[PDB]
Amino acid sequence: KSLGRHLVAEFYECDREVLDNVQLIEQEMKQAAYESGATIVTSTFHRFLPYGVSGVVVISE
Amino acid sequence: KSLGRHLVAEFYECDREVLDNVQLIEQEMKQAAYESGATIVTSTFHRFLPYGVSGVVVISE
Amino acid sequence: XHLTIHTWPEYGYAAIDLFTCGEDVDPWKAFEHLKKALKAKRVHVVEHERGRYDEI
Amino acid sequence: XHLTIHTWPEYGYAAIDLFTCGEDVDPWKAFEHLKKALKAKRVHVVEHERGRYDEI
Ligand SMILES: C[SH](C)C[C@H]1O[C@@H](n2cnc3c(N)ncnc32)[C@H](O)[C@@H]1O
Ligand SMILES: C[SH](C)C[C@H]1O[C@@H](n2cnc3c(N)ncnc32)[C@H](O)[C@@H]1O
Structure with a gap:
């Protein structure tokens, strides 16, 4: 029905250490x-x- | 309000030459x-x- | 974050995302410039609030 | 198309976008992998159709 599907997501209370790791991300x-x-x-x-x-x-x- | 503002836009009937010009885009x-x-x-x-x-x-x- | 564009010259269609952060940055200025530059004749725009203060 | 991510470690928040094209690609499979990696305990996701055939 569409050329593409797009998910807009809000992630809360994530692992703060993982969030600040550019390599892991x-x-x-x-x-x-x-x-x-x-x-x-x-x-x-x-x-x-x-x-x-x-x-x-x-x-x- | 919020950390960011996000416009999800659909552009229709554009100038087709411009859409295919990577340098111009x-x-x-x-x-x-x-x-x-x-x-x-x-x-x-x-x-x-x-x-x-x-x-x-x-x-x- | 980011400003993105994905075009489909065959259909004269472009999928545009204008995600800005902070008060001094206005995504609508970027929209105004691109609408003009691409010569789009019809548009549909949905504005999202990313990271709503009361959610985080 | 693109998969994007913007994190605010100071708030434990992350703005994620998963824009895929075609039947061979499932954006929800990406969502699932990230939800695990980032250890998110609360999520809100809205699915948008980009380039609807009845519009282009
Ligand atoms: C930029 S894109 C998302 C869409 C444009 O790229 C052309 N194209 C070419 N090959 C591919 C491919 N393998 N995957 C996705 N798009 C492809 C589309 O026709 C469209 O113009
Ligand atoms: C990844 S980003 C979109 C958000 C994260 O980056 C930090 N940061 C650092 N410098 C900037 C800046 N000039 N504008 C916006 N965010 C900034 C934010 O604090 C957040 O952690």
Whole structure:
């Protein structure tokens, strides 16, 4: 019915140590992309200061 | 209110040449980031074949 | 965070996401610029509040 | 398309987006893997249809 499906999720009370780990988040995000059956094109992860992580995984059909 | 504001948008009947121009799209996305007042952290744009453009501008502050 | 775009030149359609943080950053300015740049004639926009203060 | 994540460790919060294209890709499988990794104990998810055929 649509070209794509999009989930907008709010995660609360997460493991604060995991949230501030740029390495772990990158691993889990990529593994998450594998689980979905998508093809990873590229990915970029940034570690904010003093805390915070941002990560994007560009995928394709 | 909230930590962030997120616009989920559907653009219809666009100029099809522009949508398939990866260089132009990157230029316009970076400008939009600039116009919103956001700082550009990283940028990555992919040109799909036979047609299509995917792009991401990680921002902050 | 992030500003993203995924286009489908075949259908003249673009999936745009404008996710900004803080009060001094306005995603609607980015929307205004992209609408003009892409020449979109019709749009549908849903605004979400990410990380609502009373939820966290 | 994209899978994105933005964390606020100071609040134990994370804004996640799972935008996939095609029948071969299930965004909920990604959601499940992340829910476990981040050890989230409370979640809210809204599913959007991007590029509805009856619109494009
Ligand atoms: C990952 S992000 C979207 C949010 C996390 O990054 C930290 N941070 C660091 N510098 C900035 C900034 N200039 N703008 C927004 N957030 C900032 C936040 O505190 C949060 O942990
Ligand atoms: C940018 S995308 C999400 C959509 C555009 O890319 C073209 N395309 C080409 N190959 C692929 C693929 N393997 N997965 C997803 N899209 C593909 C689409 O036709 C659309 O223009």
